[PDB]
Amino acid sequence: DPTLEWFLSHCHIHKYPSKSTLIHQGEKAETLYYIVKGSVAVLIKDEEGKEMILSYLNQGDFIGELGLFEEGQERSAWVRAKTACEVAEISYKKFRQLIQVNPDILMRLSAQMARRLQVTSEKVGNLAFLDVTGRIAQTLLNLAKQPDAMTHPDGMQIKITRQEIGQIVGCSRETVGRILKMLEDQNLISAHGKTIVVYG
Amino acid sequence: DPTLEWFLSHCHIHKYPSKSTLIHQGEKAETLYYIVKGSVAVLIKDEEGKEMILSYLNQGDFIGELGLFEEGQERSAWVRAKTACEVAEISYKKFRQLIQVNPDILMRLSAQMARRLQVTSEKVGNLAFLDVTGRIAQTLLNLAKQPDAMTHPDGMQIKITRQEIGQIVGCSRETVGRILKMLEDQNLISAHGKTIVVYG
DNA sequence: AAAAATGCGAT
DNA sequence: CTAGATCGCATTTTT
DNA sequence: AAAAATGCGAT
DNA sequence: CTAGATCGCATTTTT
Numbered sequence A, B: 001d002p003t004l005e006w007f008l009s010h011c012h013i014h015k016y017p018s019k020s021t022l023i024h025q026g027e028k029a030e031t032l033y034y035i036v037k038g039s040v041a042v043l044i045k046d047e048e049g050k051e052m053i054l055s056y057l058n059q060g061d062f063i064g065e066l067g068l069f070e071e072g073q074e075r076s077a078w079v080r081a082k083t084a085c086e087v088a089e090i091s092y093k094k095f096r097q098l099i100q101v102n103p104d105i106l107m108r109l110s111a112q113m114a115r116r117l118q119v120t121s122e123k124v125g126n127l128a129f130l131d132v133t134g135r136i137a138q139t140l141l142n143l144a145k146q147p148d149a150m151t152h153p154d155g156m157q158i159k160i161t162r163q164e165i166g167q168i169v170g171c172s173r174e175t176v177g178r179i180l181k182m183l184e185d186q187n188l189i190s191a192h193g194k195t196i197v198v199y200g
Numbered sequence C, E: 001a002a003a004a005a006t007g008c009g010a011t
Numbered sequence D, F: 001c002t003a004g005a006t007c008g009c010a011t012t013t014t015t
């Protein structure tokens, strides 16, 4: 779209290698991010260090928008890179100015926030209403419908650790591994290492 | 603020008695709400009918904003009145027009969405990281810091059923009642019926 | 060759 | 009862 | 006088 | 093991 090259034209483009940190929880927020290319993960932590992924984010997504509305706000979560990234970055102070010339970009953001709120809420009912099995099941399903999913003769093929599915459904990596074995025991999937074939 | 009487001036003011439904899950969303007075509850459901409160909302809060950004969107949750209410209502079609004359009101909304996303996320870690006891504890604490909380000689006094705390922390009313007894067993609170004194 | 991820499995 | 978290390391799977 | 909310407590 | 969900109704607490 037209207003994109414009917005982009006023941003600092930065790169972040996979596994790195773009945003740190608790720090003063003054910057806005826009993923130009790559995937990141939004995570929160417990006192011990156990992580909980709240979302994944991709091209076309803004990051660090939450601290843009109320003075002296802190980052609400850690944001780490899943792959290599190319993020457009801009100063809140700056951004505020762009949306005056054109509030339409502010709209584009608010929409995202709306979608985000929808899914988080959806994620709340999930933790409240489904048991691990169901949560893992719904996850392999979502994962398989993703574009980065590999096409395989018996269904779709994904790659991910028991550990990370655990940080997604909110359980222990041990519980994942066991539910996994059961889902295979029931001929629903077929896992070998990080590779899981979700049968169709 | 000035832009308020303005926005308000273009809304239909409606009243809703306590226990009633302002928004129904799954229906076509075309209206925006603004709580002028009163408290509501945002809830989602499981196939059985068990409810899960995602939030409470008060004066100064917008409701039904999520379906305002993408064409043909459906309400994401039920919104029910906790008390009697006076809600300002307006057509999305209309609203869209007000934020052109003044995108500043759109800002006010987006902020709310930001805060909402923060707390829901906070609520996700809670379900993932805390056990019922801890969740109930954090809840009586929050409830007691609320303005509608009654001031009592030994601390703060709140009124609420075991059933509803359950729909808040996401557990069975039976589990609430038992944790309650334990918290009293430990001289932390003192419950008699819907009344609970959270000792200070 | 390492660093990460796993599973044990009886509590 | 039913569903999950633990634990310290050696064994196995991935960068 | 009802309608709602509770607790049983052994599984 | 530790933490929670169940179940059908009579008893108790609230509108």
Ligand SMILES: Nc1ncnc2c1ncn2[C@@H]1O[C@@H]2COP(=O)(O)O[C@H]2[C@H]1O
Residues within 6 Å of the ligand: A049, A050, A051, A052, A162, A163, A164, A165, A166, A167, A168, A170, A171, A172, A173, A174, B127, B128, B129
């Ligand atoms: N309730 C939870 N219990 C345990 N781990 C959790 C929870 N919620 C999120 N997690 C995280 O998810 C991870 C799954 O695998 P791990 O056992 O290695 O470590 C777990 C934590 O880091």
Ligand SMILES: Nc1ncnc2c1ncn2[C@@H]1O[C@@H]2COP(=O)(O)O[C@H]2[C@H]1O
Residues within 6 Å of the ligand: A023, A029, A042, A054, A055, A062, A063, A064, A065, A066, A067, A074, A075, A076, A077, A078, A079, A116, A120, B117, B121
């Ligand atoms: N629940 C969520 N879902 C999706 N993205 C989120 C969520 N919570 C936080 N984020 C993103 O992660 C960012 C962390 O820092 P900010 O608070 O600046 O802004 C946050 C959002 O961009």
Ligand SMILES: Nc1ncnc2c1ncn2[C@@H]1O[C@@H]2COP(=O)(O)O[C@H]2[C@H]1O
Residues within 6 Å of the ligand: A127, A128, A129, B049, B050, B051, B052, B162, B163, B164, B165, B166, B167, B168, B170, B171, B172, B173, B174
């Ligand atoms: N995981 C859950 N298990 C049971 N009830 C739940 C859950 N999440 C939300 N709830 C709701 O919270 C209510 C608490 O009291 P009830 O047992 O009457 O009914 C429960 C459901 O309506």
Ligand SMILES: Nc1ncnc2c1ncn2[C@@H]1O[C@@H]2COP(=O)(O)O[C@H]2[C@H]1O
Residues within 6 Å of the ligand: A117, A121, B023, B029, B042, B054, B055, B062, B063, B064, B065, B066, B067, B074, B075, B076, B077, B078, B079, B116, B120
């Ligand atoms: N997680 C949430 N926290 C707070 N309010 C919410 C949440 N999810 C939905 N709502 C509100 O409830 C409304 C239900 O209908 P809408 O989707 O129009 O818009 C929704 C929001 O106004």
